[PDB]
């Protein structure tokens, strides 16, 4: 294909125009005051959205070069959401400010490489300062309002989340279930979870979040990389007698064909899934038979001693519910029985004494807590099930935030945290002035999220930013109530996890943007 | 896809042009004098319509941005019809007036957010005042002319509706049936209804209102979310022996495939339907076996104790007629027999004493009245059945209005009600003047429906609006007879239900329109 | 109308501060909060008594600027129609 | 330059008020009422200048802060006297 080659300022000017168009649309929707963006939908009334992610995914530009600049910022903003579940608009507000000023400095003939180093040095220092700024919210009492604040300042969703982590503070998995009673129901089931993606991108089922809630499927568990269609078809034939969905847990399938192919064949037919087992080698294999002991299943392949093909519905695990997604496999409640599952407890307690490897010891002491801790199951018993269905997303909204908050503590929400780092590290100086200019570009960019939010509020951003900069600690503007106060006390706070991720991702995209010598795109 | 990005006044000016084009066409058809709009039809003479809904659905604009502005007003006008069955043109007359003036205020640099708050504050106050304005029409004597007025001022259709609600005043379901006698026939059959939509949008049958009148089908009733094509095909084979249509009542089907698919497969073949059971959990399940007791059927699935597949035509409910639509399931007369149906009456009377939950008590006392109240069946015995078929739509016309009227009472029809709220709340003032301007924009907009109607009448709107504003209570212009009088006495009135819905929906679309910072549409 | 004139009178200070690069509104608030000749020395980017710092403007020039601006501006706001040669 | 900046602000604020539906002529009368009062207050604020130190300072500020220009004009101011003309 013919490729259009662009160079120097020619390419950079095109890239900035694309960054600006995407940032402008995402920036208006920052904070409680974010103005709605009308997104054309192909049939039906155009969607009106106050959410940055929907607008960003929508934005595509017709200029090949301008689109490439927009796409690069979008992927880093999405990466911020992957690390912590929000920060998508904040990442683009920060990225646009660093990128626009940095590109202008490069257009002044300044060395791009140390401009990049100076911005990165300031970012690393700011990240350490943010951790110092952090308020540990480990205690359940802190979790109680942290969770209420986390759920878009809603007490009802927050308290249920807080009630369960009252159950497990930290690592206990908590899941959201539609309530079967009009009173809310919470129980802890000693099920399981592991952070392993599904073996095709296309396994998505009914919940609009790329995920696979699955009611009473049976589970295959395999100890060699499975020979595919010839011996999986017997099992699929057996599975299709009963009518239940199947999940493959394995090393992989012999996957170049059928791990790609099976989800394109089987969605409309039967619904069948596949996932990687956790860790590698003996740990993966041992962990698969740990998984087996907990589900009630046994592990199966031609290779070791326990042939696959003629397997029945008894020769499987089963779980009352399963969740599976791009990045996670979750077992909500096995068919396995208390005594058999506790065939494990004697060994796992024993090996913790003595294991000759430090990470084997760590894995064993992680595994026993995990195995016994289980999954906290929250049933949202709202009077209206459509409304608990609606609040169900906010509850998933909340635990993403609450989990991030417990992991890194909390910072003064509002860009007050970035203002105090900016004021805190004004002293930091670059070795050369290209480096010095880079430090300043990063510091000025840190002010941009607070200023954009006050602009959406209609307050002129400068008076407020001057007052917030002048103020002490968590003194900040609550734009929803339009007055200054202590933000943490007022109830505006976010995890140090979220702010740190947005700043780091914004810095990386900006550095690449400043140092991009040439852009090659397909000819229009 | 390449997306055209618009910003600030650039987008708003495009959106206003689209709102204006749609509003202009809908506004001319307001009231008895509404001038006809010729709607091109692809083959045959162009339809001439004095109905706003037909014109609004028709209007589509070629500019991507202009169409998006029109579509947003259309969906809110349709939402007004969904809440109460009319108000579609009135919503657009009100929406255009708030949107045009509000956009002009935003174009004056005024803060969009409080303009929005000021309009909304005035609307909330006006809604309370409208309820104070309300005349309770609960009494059957009030229903008698309320119904006559409701049926486009026709006494014949109104009296039959009034005669049946003489039967049940309020909650008793009343249905319209083609008369089998030349004398009108009215009977009350203790059948059933529940406000649950059908499980595909495409289930539509013979009546031109998206609905499913169905003569003697048999009914499936299921107590688990059904395993689909493999065990539904036996039943479908059994059903297709007899030749009757089938309805699935269930939690759902295992629906991602066959609940979407079945209506695309089975329309031309056999005609088969599916609906959600009412409520959730024990209440849904109990209510399904309440439904079972009343129809004469029993509830069926693999899961609890009563396998599906080999079921006969006896192992079903049956009803003489059924109605099903986007939002409702109706059972007109079971096959069930008096004594068996009254297997229920002892329990339902008993549990009302003692139930330990307040909403369980409410559901029980709602359920007994509902179960015994039944469906009032009106047979329109006109001398001409084509004419009773024609009047049949007006009778459906009437009960939509009569039901709304009994629920909220009635207000001086004619925009006289909105004039008196506007005059009543002239005192209301915004905290800031952006808020003050918003209150005034809402108040001036309230006058627009009366003025548009007098303009269609050919009276200049100002003299009449000045006189109506000056006059007392229900003093208003009867544009059909072209003279002022007491509107309620003259026979021009509408439910508080209808006016309140139109004002609320118009305010919501206007606020979004004023605060829309950016519009993203697919490139032309 | 009186308010429009008073708000406009703050405009020269804001524009000098904008040319300096400091935030005009923040400086305007400090000067408005201050009293007497307290003002922002644009060259030294500091706040001090203007007479003491030597920043003095002739009264005739300031008075003339206000009167001339008000007369032309007041007529311009009243314009409702413009008639000009077709391009 | 200051007259243009003041005029631009009065027109921008006035046009926004006319857009709100405020009668344009009434705003013009209000602007004029404020200006007449402001001119009197400038006369009260004014303190006379004839010190050659002050004469140099008004010259320096008027010359984009050129100290030499103000210094020389004060001396020429001094030598010619009030009836004198400086070119
Ligand atoms: N009531 C408020 N007062 C001040 N700012 C707020 C308030 N609530 C949230 N914020 C801040 O505004 C941002 C939330 O805006 P949001 O629309 O969710 O964009 P994003 O997805 O990038 O976080 C966060 O930075 C949050 O800290
Ligand atoms: N005889 C009449 N006198 C005055 N106005 C009337 C008369 N009859 C109805 N109206 C008013 O005119 C409106 C009915 O117009 P219509 O064409 O049905 O549009 P819409 O569907 O929005 O109600 C209602 O607001 C009604 O109150
Ligand atoms: N350091 C200073 N502080 C503030 N303003 C200054 C300073 N020095 C000179 N000025 C000038 O700024 C304005 C001068 O305007 P100028 O640009 O010289 O053109 P003109 O006098 O025709 O309006 C005056 O307010 C004057 O005070
Ligand atoms: Mg957010
Ligand atoms: Mg109508």
Coordinates of C-alpha atoms in Angstrom, one line a residue, chain B residues 218-222 226-249 266 270-273 298 300-302 306-317:
Chain B
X218 CA -53.0 -22.0 24.7
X219 CA -50.5 -20.6 27.3
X220 CA -47.1 -22.0 28.6
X221 CA -46.2 -21.0 32.2
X222 CA -42.6 -21.7 33.3
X226 CA -36.2 -22.1 29.9
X227 CA -33.5 -24.2 28.0
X228 CA -34.5 -23.2 24.5
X229 CA -34.8 -24.9 21.1
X230 CA -34.1 -28.5 22.1
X231 CA -37.0 -28.8 24.6
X232 CA -39.2 -26.0 23.2
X233 CA -39.4 -27.9 19.8
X234 CA -41.4 -30.9 21.3
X235 CA -44.0 -28.4 22.7
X236 CA -44.0 -26.5 19.4
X237 CA -44.5 -29.8 17.6
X238 CA -47.4 -30.6 19.9
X239 CA -48.8 -27.0 19.5
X240 CA -48.4 -27.3 15.7
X241 CA -50.6 -30.5 15.8
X242 CA -53.6 -28.4 17.0
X243 CA -52.6 -25.3 15.0
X244 CA -53.1 -22.8 17.8
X245 CA -50.6 -20.0 18.7
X246 CA -48.5 -20.4 21.9
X247 CA -47.5 -17.8 24.5
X248 CA -44.4 -18.4 26.8
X249 CA -44.8 -16.9 30.3
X266 CA -41.9 -18.2 13.6
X270 CA -46.9 -20.5 13.2
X271 CA -47.1 -17.3 15.4
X272 CA -45.6 -17.8 18.9
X273 CA -45.1 -15.2 21.7
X298 CA -49.9 -25.3 35.9
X300 CA -43.6 -26.1 34.2
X301 CA -39.7 -26.6 34.1
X302 CA -37.0 -29.2 34.5
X306 CA -42.3 -30.8 36.7
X307 CA -40.4 -31.4 33.4
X308 CA -41.3 -29.5 30.2
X309 CA -40.6 -31.4 26.9
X310 CA -43.4 -34.0 26.4
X311 CA -46.3 -31.6 27.4
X312 CA -49.7 -32.0 25.8
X313 CA -52.4 -29.4 24.9
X314 CA -54.0 -30.2 28.3
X315 CA -50.8 -29.3 30.1
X316 CA -51.2 -25.6 29.2
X317 CA -53.5 -22.7 30.1

